Ligand binder design. Structure first.
Ligand code: HEM
Ligand code: A1ASU
Length: 456
């Protein structure tokens, strides 16, 4: 099927047999999407092994795929590798089964239900401050990945199951051990193989091989059973078991798999984005000072932030949004075409993966002035409405966007406020001023960001 885009009159790199264009992934997903956009223009296609992938960049065409024709045509993402019982997760559920899961879990992420999570989240904001002050009063350079990763674990554990632990200073607890335990290696030899060898995916399903290590899942599967046995609470687990008794209902095996991806998504993202924010704040002290001035103005005398005060901080929203533009951790948005459909004057055949290159759009000079720079002023209210909502898609769009968007934004902002209320961050020895992105399948820096923490 290597002649598809040739017959459709769609440009793209010439694919090799059995490999497609995966050899061009040697500079990471980010660099490959940039070069193809510059060479082939608005629309191009390539191959991940035998799988044809059509990249679209027209905002009207993006809206049709992600919003207008989401339920009818572009409903599911590309099939993942061996998942086992995790096939019931909402992030990989398909068609009607996903629609049931999305509706059953939508009330869990309401703005009203998010308010009640602020007191628990803010509880570990001060825990993070104490962990930073112990490393700041000693003048030790701080790897943000460890402290922010510790903070994100504390928020996820308490918000999901109510478990209250200082993961940074309790790495030996049985709960933190399994949750941290995970293979963190999309361009790893495994995921590169299943691209060339998608036929081997059902092989590993019957072998009971899962991308999730079976030790962690069995611990989490058994742990949730004990918590349900114990069953006021306002955490994710209660909010889902409450929906069980409340359109069909959620099974206790679905409930476990549903909550696992919340930890999956909540843990790695939050910490990674927070480190990306702090690198920019360290390399741009003027933004950090202006953000610190705003944080102190809304919250005098280092006042504890609440749900309402965070949403008032406009520059904090600008700082978060601009960092997400420079570093869209998804790097891509994908939908599988379910049928022969003509959209925006173009024929997309069945089974093709339609891809939206979020990274290549976020740095396209056509839509962003000096895209390679860090300019929070792009998202000021004066310049805010000139941004097309289908070019800047940090959390996706349409019915299948990031369901935990508001929680994640609240969690990171509550973290930034408490940290910036008490500390200022400056570059250190190994700051790596030209921050290099990892050439792998994950949007992370080549080397972990290390900075100096000074007590105000
Ligand atoms: C920095 C934080 C985060 C970012 C930048 C982010 C971004 C994204 C993106 C780009 C998608 C794909 C949407 C698309 O295909 O159109 C997504 C999906 C998703 N995210 Fe997040 N996300 C974040 C945090 C979280 C958290 C903390 C949770 C936990 C509840 C979460 C849960 C999900 C789920 C469940 C999906 C799948 C949606 C579906 O298939 O129905 N995300 N996220
Ligand atoms: C490990 O680095 C990441 C973790 C989570 C996310 C993330 C953000 N928003 N969603 N999300 C996500 C991604 C994949 C799954 C997944 C893979 S396999 C399975 C059953 N679920 C679930 C959630 C992004 C990067």
């Amino acid at each position: 099927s290597h002649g598809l885009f040739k017959k459709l009159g769609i440009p793209g790199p010439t694919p090799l047999p059995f490999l497609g264009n995966i050899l061009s992934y040697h500079k990471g997903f980010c660099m490959f999407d940039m070069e193809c956009h510059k060479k082939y223009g608005k629309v191009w296609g390539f191959y991940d092994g035998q799988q044809p992938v059509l990249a679209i960049t027209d905002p009207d065409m993006i809206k049709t795929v992600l919003v207008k024709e989401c339920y009818s045509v572009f409903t599911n993402r590309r099939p993942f590798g061996p998942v086992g019982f995790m096939k019931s997760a909402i992030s990989i559920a398909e068609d009607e089964e996903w629609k049931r899961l999305r509706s059953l879990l939508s009330p869990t992420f309401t703005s009203g239900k998010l308010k009640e999570m602020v007191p628990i989240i803010a509880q570990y904001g001060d825990v993070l401050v104490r962990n930073l002050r112990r490393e700041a009063e000693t003048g030790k350079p701080v790897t943000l990945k460890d402290v922010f990763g510790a903070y994100s674990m504390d928020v996820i554990t308490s918000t999901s199951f109510g478990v209250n632990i200082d993961s940074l200073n309790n790495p030996q607890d049985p709960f933190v051990e399994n949750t941290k335990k995970l293979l963190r290696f999309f361009l790893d030899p495994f995921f590169l193989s299943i691209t060339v060898f998608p036929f081997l995916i059902p092989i590993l399903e019957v072998l009971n091989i899962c991308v999730f290590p079976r030790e962690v899942t069995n611990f989490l599967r058994k742990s949730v059973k004990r918590m349900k046995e114990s069953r006021h609470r306002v955490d994710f687990l209660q909010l889902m078991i409450d929906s069980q008794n409340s359109h069909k209902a959620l099974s206790d095996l679905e409930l476990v798999a549903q909550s696992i991806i919340f930890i999956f998504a909540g843990y790695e993202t939050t910490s990674s984005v927070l480190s990306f924010i702090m690198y920019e704040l360290a390399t741009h002290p003027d933004v950090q000072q202006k953000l610190q001035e705003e944080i102190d103005a809304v919250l005098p005398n280092k006042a504890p932030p609440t749900y309402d005060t965070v949403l008032q901080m406009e520059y904090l929203d600008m700082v978060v949004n601009e960092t997400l533009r420079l570093f869209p951790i998804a790097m891509r948005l994908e939908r599988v075409c379910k049928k022969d459909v003509e959209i925006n004057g173009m024929f997309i055949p069945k089974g093709v993966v339609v891809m939206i290159p979020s990274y290549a759009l976020h740095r396209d000079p056509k839509y962003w002035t000096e895209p390679e720079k860090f300019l929070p002023e792009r998202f000021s209210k004066k310049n805010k409405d000139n941004i097309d909502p289908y070019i800047y898609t940090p959390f996706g769009s349409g019915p299948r966007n990031c369901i935990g968007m508001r929680f994640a934004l609240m969690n990171m902002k509550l973290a930034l406020i408490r940290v910036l209320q008490n500390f200022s961050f400056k570059p250190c020895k190994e700051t790596q001023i030209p921050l290099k992105l990892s050439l792998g399948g994950l949007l992370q820096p080549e080397k972990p960001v290390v900075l100096k923490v000074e007590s105000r």
